[PDB]
């Protein structure tokens, strides 16, 4: 587990990347975001996450908004 | 996706195991369940989810309740 800041988010899709201090971004999709509410994420959103393996390669899971 | 039944879960813990035929149970942890439901699975139902490499091995992802 770790954080990070929402780099880009693109609401309609659904989709977009976490920065990563020192490290490489990271995709996000909606259907990782925690919480109540609409699944969606704002640029500079702070965020708590851990990265997984898929067939499409490495992508955040347990996104939780700080 | 991927098909399977869930084999049990602790919903005071937040996980249980999917079985899958002819393969490994795959650990599920709450925080992968979809919908505005209770994040929560009980025994024998039928689920679709994608399985991920996470850092204690293969879980699942996007577990949606059918
Ligand atoms: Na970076």
Do not use: L
């Given at each position: 587990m770790q954080?990070?800041?929402?780099k880009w988010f693109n609401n309609e899709?659904?989709?977009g990347f976490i920065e990563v201090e020192g490290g490489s971004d990271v995709f996000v999709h909606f259907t990782?975001?925690?919480?109540?509410?609409?699944?969606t994420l704002e640029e500079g959103?702070?965020?708590?996450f851990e990265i997984v393996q898929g067939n499409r390669g490495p992508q955040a899971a347990n996104?939780?908004?700080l």
């Open positions: 954080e990070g800041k929402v899709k659904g989709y990782a975001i925690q919480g109540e509410g609409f699944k959103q702070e965020v708590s996104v939780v908004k």
